[PDB]
Design a protein around this ligand. Structure first.
Ligand SMILES: Cc1cc2nc3c(=O)[nH]c(=O)nc-3n(C[C@H](O)[C@H](O)[C@H](O)COP(=O)(O)OP(=O)(O)OC[C@H]3O[C@@H](n4cnc5c(N)ncnc54)[C@H](O)[C@@H]3O)c2cc1C
Ligand SMILES: Cc1cc2nc3c(=O)[nH]c(=O)nc-3n(C[C@H](O)[C@H](O)[C@H](O)COP(=O)(O)OP(=O)(O)OC[C@H]3O[C@@H](n4cnc5c(N)ncnc54)[C@H](O)[C@@H]3O)c2cc1C
Ligand code: NA
Ligand code: NA
Ligand SMILES: [Zn+2]
Ligand SMILES: [Zn+2]
Ligand SMILES: [Zn+2]
Ligand SMILES: [Zn+2]
Ligand SMILES: [Zn+2]
Ligand SMILES: [Zn+2]
Ligand SMILES: [Zn+2]
Ligand SMILES: [Zn+2]
Lengths: 112, 112
């Protein structure tokens, strides 16, 4: 029960972000589309890893969140995460698997 | 690497929320105060535990986030969490300890 470090906070943050994405509507209202884009922007203002937050705001200044549908947003966010992975020398996550990882469980049923 | 369940997602969500609070400014601008209140409201719209999110929106409809300073917000959020703890038959967290838990580490140095 110590304050989470960069690694622990980062993992939990992605878990939160990818989970919210995984359950976002397939057919969001215009308000939901605006709200979710604003949510990601606000996260970028307050994420307390200052280097991380700066990096993120830079990225979002060009690459605005795609919140048009669940499919779009889950893909958008998976790609954003892979950009961070690449910076940190981590492998790309296969974005075609984003639903298995964050909603449905692996196809082999190992999460059932 | 399975989709987090209610318990795992909840723990990580509180970790994220209390950490953002712990590092929020002592002297936030009016824009930061509005932004952080909006951030909490948006979280309440998208948190995918539907019972949880409903519960939260109900609470926030009366008890709006206090984002006036770091001290206020960390306390506000600790109290909000304790309301949820109480519903779930968990003990109250001592809010006077919120900085030890989420920023500084325990006074005994066990986190150093
Ligand atoms: C917006 C943001 C920005 C950050 N910027 C920085 C930074 O600039 N510098 C820095 O050092 N750290 C940064 N971090 C923290 C960093 O990205 C990691 O969270 C941290 O290094 C821990 O890495 P990890 O290997 O445990 O797994 P993480 O990258 O935390 O991934 C957690 C899990 O998510 C899954 N996953 C991995 N990639 C993807 C993907 N593309 N899509 C969907 N799921 C995936 C995997 O199952 C993985 O185990 C940032 C975090 C966030 C949320
Ligand atoms: C906004 C929100 C709402 C939720 N609503 C529900 C709900 O209606 N029903 C439901 O079943 N679950 C709900 N959850 C999930 C639930 O609150 C817990 O996260 C989950 O049951 C796991 O509990 P836990 O005992 O692991 O610790 P959590 O309550 O997840 O706490 C994690 C850690 O935070 C620290 N902590 C505990 N209390 C406080 C506090 N008051 N202030 C600061 N730090 C604290 C402790 O170190 C604790 O180990 C909600 C979560 C959130 C974020
Ligand atoms: Na660590
Ligand atoms: Na569990
Ligand atoms: Zn690292
Ligand atoms: Zn943790
Ligand atoms: Zn699109
Ligand atoms: Zn790219
Ligand atoms: Zn529970
Ligand atoms: Zn986890
Ligand atoms: Zn106040
Ligand atoms: Zn109360």
């Amino acid at each position: 029960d110590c304050p989470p470090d960069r690694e622990e906070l980062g993992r939990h943050s992605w878990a939160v972000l990818h989970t919210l994405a995984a359950y976002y509507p397939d057919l969001p209202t215009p308000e939901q589309q605006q709200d979710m884009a604003q949510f990601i922007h606000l996260f970028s203002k307050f994420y307390p890893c200052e280097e991380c937050a700066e990096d993120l705001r830079k990225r979002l200044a060009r690459n605005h969140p795609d919140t048009r549908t669940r499919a779009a947003f889950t893909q958008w966010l998976c790609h954003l995460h892979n950009e961070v992975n690449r910076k940190l020398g981590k492998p790309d996550f296969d974005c075609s698997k984003v639903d298995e990882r964050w909603r449905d469980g692996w196809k082999d049923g190992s999460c059932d």
